[PDB]
Design a binder for this molecule. Structure first.
Ligand SMILES: O=C[C@H](O)[C@@H](O)[C@H](O)CO
Ligand SMILES: O=C[C@H](O)[C@@H](O)[C@H](O)CO
Ligand SMILES: O=C[C@H](O)[C@@H](O)[C@H](O)CO
Ligand SMILES: O=C[C@H](O)[C@@H](O)[C@H](O)CO
Ligand SMILES: [Mg+2]
Ligand SMILES: [Mg+2]
Ligand SMILES: [Mg+2]
Ligand SMILES: [Mg+2]
Ligand SMILES: [Mg+2]
Ligand SMILES: [Mg+2]
Ligand SMILES: [Mg+2]
Ligand SMILES: [Mg+2]
Lengths: 385, 385, 385, 385
């Protein structure tokens, strides 16, 4: 179960670089230089890394320091063959973003947020990123009268429209991906789920430039089924990127390593990506727990990759088993794929076998045989066939 | 706080008519005749009622019995002046719908479901309903391999497209409203939230015919902010109807009377509907608890109405208070309503006050004064001004 | 992975006998005769069955019909070698229990509830049950003013004290087990968790007669860690029985087969029971989903058993691996088992190495190596060693 | 609604002193000197303050600096008449406590934790505190194999036993209060709820010295009913202190001002404390949101107090209304307070009216009239009588 760069595994600098500060505790680890993270990830078999502007260039850096930070990063990429497929902006840490970036009540803040983003899109393109993520962590409220949501969505739409006009004007080959989350750090965050982000996109001036970057733990914080949310994004043709991690239910965002948290959900996710032929990066947005030292950091990052490869093997064995293919037919998955009324509305209306002469009792008595199917899936996941 | 028909309060027959059967207990009340519900609601000040096909005409009724059930209902409407603004289909109770209606794996079931719906649309129009609701309570799964979601969404789209072709062909003046719910009775239900339903609509053949019918308790079962979800639907121009009730957090669907559950959320909802000028029915989808007799039923239905009118008064007092209008300006709600960059992209790019010369520290130090605003809202709700 | 009666697997009659009625749907299966369930379970390798009074003898049965129901049951037990290790009372289905049994506001109801229970304790003893379970599903409220909790706990204590006086007076060899649940069917249920039940026991007249019967899905409906709750019950010496099933988070009670739901939690539970030497029945309180026919029922019941045996094998392989034993020492599990200050308070107070000369920085820098340990556990569960 | 010191309102230094650092953002406010907090709270009408050792004396302070910090604090108390009714220890912030204090795997850590606590008990007594709180925020785990819970509870018991031996030996007049929380910052925390803490106490060497300090938001993070949990603690005679705040459901700990979050729950809590004659401090453990400046801090602290006094007035009006007293009798709250069988077991057994001749149907048909009662409570809370 050894990863290789062909597996397309990616990590954010902020993941293995998290120092361990939480709401109740100080850092337990020293800061990592981005150059060291690049080398250590390459050695483990990763394909590439991602960054927020502030992870690479310290907030308030002069143009000089900015250039120095970039050249050193670029050298590490050349030395290792590591790529940078995605980048994003930090519109959450600095106190000026306390009420949001794109939807802050103060207009001056809103203009500042757009300028900070634009500057990072230029860098992203230079580094060859294909996707630019937006996670609006501060866009939201703790109280009802603090934010008029209709006005807030108008401001959010205005922000994304301007960003689309910018990339178009520049002739850049980059697409945007909105990353939803239901709460934390704000009491409620705008565009809380995959569904809300999808619906919003459809009201932008050039919808083709925007998709979603869903995260396992985010949808789970609302108690939702992650693989179902992913299938809806695929169905809409909007899965531009994905963030993998673990979460144990509805509580604070834990960001466990991928595989931890809801293991069966992880199995069904892998099945789906591999089946649908998803060809983007397999990105890990996680935090090695603050109980660990540096050895523990690298062990947790390696586990992310190892769990995906184990699940891949098991899902493929499941789909290739003749006994499973038979079970799928027993549960009528084949019939779910056929059109309900390719014959058309008139034909359906005239068809007595669809109503007047439909035997409801006989249909009702047919078992779906879902429990035998699910046990085959359990046996495969556990390697107990 | 006396309701009148001009308040547009409506109730489903299945609400005050719920007999009290739950997963662990038998009925505690006898069945109510729809004619009696119509008269008792009219006396309390309701404007109208709604129904599922099966609430009015017992499943498996001959055409004769069907006609008799309708004429008796129609007489009660004429006697009382009660209207029927919405109707829906029961695609959940009968065992044949155990794996869904529109997205059942069995194709024959799927065709049956469409025929049962069509028959009810005709009735709805005859009764003068303006909105037809679809709640797909059985569309979903308990296990991962039982339903291919991509195929399921193709079948769901096919169903709604055929329904749109039908109403168009007939020349009917009716629109559809999809009612989301995250779980219960299925382990996970497809189109779980307001957001997922909005996104789906945009992929139908004639999106203009479809909106949402959100329910307070449904979004709360995912831990989401109901007033925020409503504002997104209004922003999209898709709030065709609304279901009011109460829910105490993330647990089974309680369907308490409106006002019970999350009271502050109810306050912010009323504020929003009244402010935005929502002109549809104020519909109550609730269940008088099984602890009550008939007197308790009517007391609970009356409380639904009374709580909405109390909240209306308080929200209006809040918005009309000079001290609140001042607080809104103090928290920059006025600035949230102004365009970020009406000057355009070039202008923004050239503006040094937006970045190069933006004083981030001064901006950061400005308090938002949200806590004083929220206490004014608390004082108003409690009548403690 | 074939079960045998020596594995101590037990099932309630109400499990494989659930007809499939839910809050939104009619039954999908016909009723099963208890005699048939006994034979079919024996064939699958079960050790025994359990019952509520009403599962075996229909409510309102004459003494004659009662005797007939018992003798037929007893014959099936003799024919198969099946045992009955636990029984309970139905104080939830009948409308008279709408506000509770032991804590109903009406005193007459409360006296009725005690009499119905006593009659079943006699039957239980005759059948050789060792444990009598109490699940107070209707003890609770939907509204704040409906129940004074202090008074309700006085009534609950009075009920259990009388039951203890009864068994003592009769000379019966039976112990009681309280089964907690946080909600459903009541808005809130009294004694919501394992912790609340443990605390209550300590205020009864003869605490030695009472323990807990925790259920996987029940603690998960509060988002709690099931294996941690079990360890506290074991620590107190109160784990008299256990109910196994599956649940996907905080939502309605799903009662999935054991192994489904939170698989890692199931792994850690098995580890704990086997390690601690729990010697009671492994009881399954679950419901085959309403999508299944009879073949699906028996497949789901067999899966319960199969998953426990797979998990048992994996947990035992984990604990026996030399590499894991080393990892446990690396994470200082050995030191967690040693007394903090066997030297005593004075010694601790005088020890400079415990404070004045304690090197906090050196201690802080020591990694706990928990992530490597957890990956060994993942590898073992998945059979990927 | 003006508070006075006779209202017994108290605040932790860490509340109004929270700088606004969260998992995703830097501080938005400067640090407050404890002396300034004391004066500003006194001016608002507070009765007193509480502290963790580290809030008053910076970690690693020399004995000299320690004395200076104390004398300055003591002067502010004398100048204002403010009292200090409770104190606690910080066993969570410093990296050395990354795996816990009392239940850290490393034995040396465990001994350090006890010494740090003891030193603070001495200070607490000198300042005249009556209650010493223990919140074990780091006692727990993110993974199953990292902590053996049975061993962890043995270590927790050992810690509290030593603390009880210490206060006894010293002749101190102080009692301990354990403050439960279900998660955050650890994936799962030991003693997660009020129930688990109550059960644990009963296994300590001198149970009379220990009670609970429950917090509104903590029980709500498990979806539990706070007023019900409080009634159980009162029933056991263990409510030594209480922490008031607000929380909007199952998510991260928000620590909103009291009154915000679940308003009806706040109403029922006030009713209960006032009815039961709770005479301890009304302590606020909350955080003014990071969106606020100093003016916003003091406005939020004042709102805590104002909401309690409004709720007090409304609950008292509710209980004093003749119409409510009648409703309580209609719902049989009077009968819930009478013994079920003061006549004894024999009498109950011989009573035919309790079973043989009990009319179950007549009893079942009696409505509980809970909905009318709950609407009277709503009308009172809203001042709409
Ligand atoms: O909740 C935080 C997000 O997951 C963050 O990692 C985004 O991906 C980056 O802005
Ligand atoms: O969860 C059930 C729904 O709320 C139901 O009332 C729909 O509105 C009608 O099909
Ligand atoms: O939630 C219902 C319970 O789990 C039930 O099965 C009890 O065990 C029997 O009274
Ligand atoms: O969750 C944190 C606690 O509520 C904290 O305030 C304790 O009261 C103090 O140790
Ligand atoms: Mg996250
Ligand atoms: Mg992310
Ligand atoms: Mg509902
Ligand atoms: Mg509804
Ligand atoms: Mg259950
Ligand atoms: Mg059970
Ligand atoms: Mg807290
Ligand atoms: Mg606290």
């Amino acid at each position: 179960y050894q990863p290789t760069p062909e597996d397309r595994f990616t990590f954010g600098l902020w993941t293995v670089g998290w120092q361990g500060r939480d709401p109740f505790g100080d850092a337990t680890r020293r800061a990592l230089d981005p150059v060291e993270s690049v080398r250590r990830l390459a050695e483990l078999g990763a394909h590439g890394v991602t960054f927020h502007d502030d992870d690479l260039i310290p907030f308030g850096s002069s143009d000089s320091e900015r250039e120095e930070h970039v050249k050193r990063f670029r050298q590490a990429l050349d030395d290792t063959g590591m790529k940078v497929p995605m980048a994003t902006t930090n519109l959450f840490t600095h106190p000026v973003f306390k009420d949001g970036g794109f939807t802050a009540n103060d207009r001056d803040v809103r203009r500042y947020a757009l300028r900070k983003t634009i500057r990072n899109i230029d860098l992203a393109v230079e580094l060859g990123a294909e996707t630019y993520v937006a996670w609006g962590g501060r866009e939201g409220a703790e109280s009802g009268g603090a934010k008029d949501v209709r006005d807030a969505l108008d401001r959010m739409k205005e922000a994304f429209d301007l960003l689309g006009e910018y990339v178009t004007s520049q002739g850049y080959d980059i697409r945007f991906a909105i990353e939803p989350k239901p709460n934390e750090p704000r009491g409620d965050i705008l565009l809380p789920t995959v569904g809300h982000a999808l619906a919003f996109i459809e009201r932008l001036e050039r919808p083709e430039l925007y998709g979603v970057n869903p995260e396992v733990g985010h949808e789970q914080m609302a108690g939702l089924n992650f693989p179902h949310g992913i299938a809806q994004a695929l169905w809409a043709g909007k899965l531009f990127h994905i963030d993998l991690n673990g979460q144990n239910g509805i509580k604070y965002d834990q960001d466990l390593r991928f595989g931890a948290g809801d293991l069966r959900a992880a199995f069904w996710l892998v099945d789906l990506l591999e089946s649908a032929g998803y060809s983007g990066p397999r990105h890990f947005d996680f935090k090695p727990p603050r109980t660990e030292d540096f050895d523990g950091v690298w062990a947790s990052a390696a586990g992310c990759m190892r769990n995906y490869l184990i699940l891949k093997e098991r899902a493929a064995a499941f789909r290739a088993d003749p006994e499973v293919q038979e079970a799928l037919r027993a549960s009528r998955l084949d019939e779910l794929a056929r059109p309900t009324a390719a014959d058309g509305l008139q034909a359906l209306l005239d068809d007595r076998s669809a109503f007047e002469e439909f035997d409801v009792d006989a249909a009702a008595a047919r078992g779906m045989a879902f429990e035998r199917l699910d046990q085959l899936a359990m046996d495969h996941l556990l390697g107990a066939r």
